[PDB]
Every structure is written in C-alpha cells, then in structure tokens.
C-alpha cells in the first residue's frame, strides 16, 4: 500500500507527518501491435546459397536483396555451416528486425582463410581480395562446398589476388590483371621482381579439410529504421488508436498512444522527430497515414500522511495528471503501482499539482499543515 | 524563486526497461541522492517565496 512504500523510502517503520515523494506511476500498455508491409514474396536466399557456380574471391558476387520478406529459417535448411559469425546483431533476433537493404557478398575461399572474413583482420584474402569495414554490421556464413567446387584433375576456375601494391579498402573489388612490380624497374612480363597478381586455387577433393573450397556469404545490413524495405517474417496486427499500446512500425519499437494528426508529411517523409530528436510521428506502412505518438501517461506519486502516530490513513497525489485519466487507468488496471487507494467519489479531487485521491476537499481555509501545492494543503482534521 | 523540477532517475536513464533498470541498480544510491537534492531545491524555493 502507499504507506508501506513511504516506510520503505524512509527506511523506517514510523512515518512523520508530511508529504513524501514515494514513487512514479506509469500507465501500462494494453495491446501489442506490429505493422509490416504488404510484401509477401520471400527473398531469393535459396538462389544465392544454392547457385550452380560461385564467382572468384577477388571478383566476389554482390547480390542485392531488397523489397522482399527475409525468412532466415530457410537459410537453416541447407546448414552445413562452418562459421555463423554475426557482428552487431544477434542471429536469434534476425527474424524480428526490418533491414533497410541487404548486400550478399558471396565468394569461395580456402578452409583456413575463413577466419580472415571478420572486421579488423589481416591476411592475403583480407587485404588483397575482400576487406570488411571496421564498423561492419551483419553476418558471415561460411560452409564447405567440396562436393561442388572440386575436380579430380584440379578446379582452376577459382583465382585469388596474392600480390597488390596497396591493401584493398572495404567493399572494394579489384579485377586488374597488371603484373605486380617489386621495386622501381617496370615489369614487361614474367621474370625477377615480377609476379602475376592472380593465382589459381586448384581445389581438389583429395586435399585436406583446411584446403577444401568453402563458400562464404557476407550478409551486410544497413540497420536504419526509415526506408523499411526488407522486414522479417512476422504477421501484422490490426492498428488500434487512442490506447496505450506497444507499437512496432517496421522495426521501430516503442510504447505509447497513436492518434490521427495534421503533420503534413511530404511524400518521401517516413517519420517525424521533435525539437530534441524524439520520434513524434510515424507513417503506417499499409494505410499510408500519419500518426502522432504520445507516450503513456506517467509522473510522480507522493503520499500525504498525518504521521504513524495519528493514523495509518494516507492520501495519494499523482502529480501532473487529470483525475479522469487516473480513474480510467485504474478501471482497466493499467497503473504501474498496483496498490490502488480506495476512492469513494468525494475523495477524488483535482488540483493543479495533480490528482489527489483519499483527501476530502472542504470549502474552508486553515493555515497550511501539509503543503500539497498550487495553494492547496492537507491536514488530518475531525469532519 | 525559480522552477521546481522533479527528475525520475530510472525513467530518464532506463525508460520502461527492466534490463537497464537491473544494471542501474548496481550503481548504488546515485539516483536517491539526485532525488534528495532536487527535493531540497524545491522546498528551498517555496521557503524563499
């Protein structure tokens, strides 16, 4: 009850007369609603992960994945995964997020070169073939492909750049065949201080596991909650307004009430931000309507008590709210402090300091005893 | 006098999140100190008037 909370805040079993700021009340959400777009067609993950032929590491294939539903359970169907390293995002959460765009960088490397596919790594493949960005966010999936990328006579179709003047920048692909030059003497062909930058892998089934060909796909996401586009496989829920709800607009997660508004979004605008960079409005992906977001009512809770001596009776001030809002929240049982103080009908009084419950308003005027605020005080009196 | 303000430490730092609240409980009695200071300021403003 409020008095026990007051005792705990004071850390004593006896409470002196006064008004004590005990806690904070919040209005809890009633329903949870998500709003994902009309797109139903699945993303072409099977084509990328089950292609007949894979490009060379120095010519890594960049596949664009956008405007589709990205179900990551399909990726688990063909899962001989040797590495499933997700950086910046938990894999288990990948089905609950909406990604602005997906880039699938697919290539073939050696088994021992898998560890080079990571941010901040160094090596032949990392520096001369494929370099990840320092702030890379996404996942890297590496799986053996010996049964498809090996030949008895030697599969020479896969080549890697072994020599280069400078290390490759992130997301940079080099296909030049200029002979590497060591020193200042120009190279007109094969010879001393001159080597071919590209070397054939020559994958063979008889080779060891560490030398077997491995298909590596780097799924890079741009986790920005504005263009939506590639959302996860979650069922949409009908929109409900004028009620404190947990909303999920294209991965934009929040809590509050949604209301029709006059914020005239331009055709390209998706969501609005306040002066202090707080999300003020959102756009419904399906109905294409503008919705102001107003977080559910919260505030301070103070307990007016006449002291442990006189009585255990208390009054509760919910600071800065309508009394009707508090009454509605109590009726539907949405208030965070669940120790609802009994209200008769004459106990509820609306002050400018907030909603005062448990104190009867008298049309008298005495010297202030317990300062509630805004010219209103309280006292334990015989009435 | 000036404006009397009240700040909820938990709501400001770890708004309606229980993981963040549990992590913030490991920082001691900082939030209680801030609440006490702000309450003292408010009562002092009323006293000034």
């Amino acid at each position: 009850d409020p008095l026990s909370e007051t005792k705990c805040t004071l850390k004593s079993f006896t409470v002196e007369k006064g008004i004590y700021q005990t806690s904070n009340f919040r209005v809890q959400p009633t329903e949870s609603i998500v709003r994902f777009p009309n797109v139903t067609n699945l993303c072409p993950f099977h084509e990328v992960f089950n292609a007949t032929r894979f490009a060379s590491v120095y010519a890594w294939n960049r596949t664009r994945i956008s405007n589709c539903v990205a179900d990551y359970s399909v990726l688990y169907n063909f899962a001989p995964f040797f590495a499933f390293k997700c950086y910046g995002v938990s894999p288990t959460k990948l089905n609950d997020l909406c990604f602005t765009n997906v880039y699938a960088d697919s290539f073939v490397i050696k088994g021992n070169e898998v560890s080079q596919i990571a941010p901040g790594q160094t090596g032949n493949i990392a520096d001369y073939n494929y370099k990840l960005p320092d702030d890379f966010t996404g996942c890297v999936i590496a799986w053996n492909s010996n049964k498809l990328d090996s030949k008895h006579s030697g599969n020479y179709d896969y080549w890697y750049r072994s020599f280069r003047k400078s290390k490759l920048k992130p997301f940079e692909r080099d296909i030049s065949t200029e002979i590497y030059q060591a020193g200042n003497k120009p190279c007109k062909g094969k010879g001393p201080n001159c080597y071919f930058p590209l070397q054939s892998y020559g994958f063979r089934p008889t080779y060891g596991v560490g030398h077997q060909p491995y298909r590596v796909v780097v799924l890079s996401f741009e986790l920005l909650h504005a263009p939506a586009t590639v959302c996860g496989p979650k069922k949409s829920t009908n929109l409900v307004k004028n009620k404190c709800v947990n909303f999920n607009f294209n991965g934009l997660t929040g809590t509050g009430v949604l209301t029709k508004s006059n914020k005239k979004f331009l055709p390209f605008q998706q969501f609005g931000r306040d002066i202090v960079d707080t999300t003020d409005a959102v756009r419904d992906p399906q109905t294409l309507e503008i919705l102001d977001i107003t977080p559910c009512s919260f505030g301070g809770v103070s307990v007016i008590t006449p002291g442990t001596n006189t009585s255990n009776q208390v009054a509760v001030l919910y600071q800065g709210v309508n009394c009707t809002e508090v009454s509605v929240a109590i009726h539907a049982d949405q208030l965070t402090p669940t120790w609802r103080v009994y209200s008769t009908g004459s106990n509820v009084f609306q002050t400018r300091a907030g909603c005062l419950i448990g104190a009867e308003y008298v049309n008298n005027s005495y010297e202030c005893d317990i300062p509630i605020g805004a010219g209103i005080c309280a006292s334990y009196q015989t009435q | 006098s000036m404006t009397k303000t009240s700040v909820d430490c938990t709501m400001y730092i770890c708004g309606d999140s229980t993981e963040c609240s549990n992590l913030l409980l490991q920082y001691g009695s900082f939030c209680t100190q801030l609440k006490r200071a702000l309450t003292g300021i408010a009562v002092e403003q009323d006293k000034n008037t």
Partner: peptide, 30 residues
C-alpha cells in the same frame, strides 16, 4: 513569459512542480 519543448521534457522523467503559493496569493501578500 514562462516556458514542443515542454512536452518533450515531460516525456522523459522531467516534470515541473507548481509553486505552493499561487500568483493570486503573492498578489494578496503584496
């Protein structure tokens, strides 16, 4: 003139307590 900025501040744990003496009471004292 006293002091959307106010709604944004009130929306993350920052509330403003009204003074105990209303401006009418201050005028009465004066």
């Amino acid at each position: 003139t006293l002091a959307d900025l106010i709604c944004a501040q009130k929306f993350n744990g920052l509330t403003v307590l009204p003074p105990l003496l209303t401006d009418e009471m201050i005028a009465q004292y004066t």
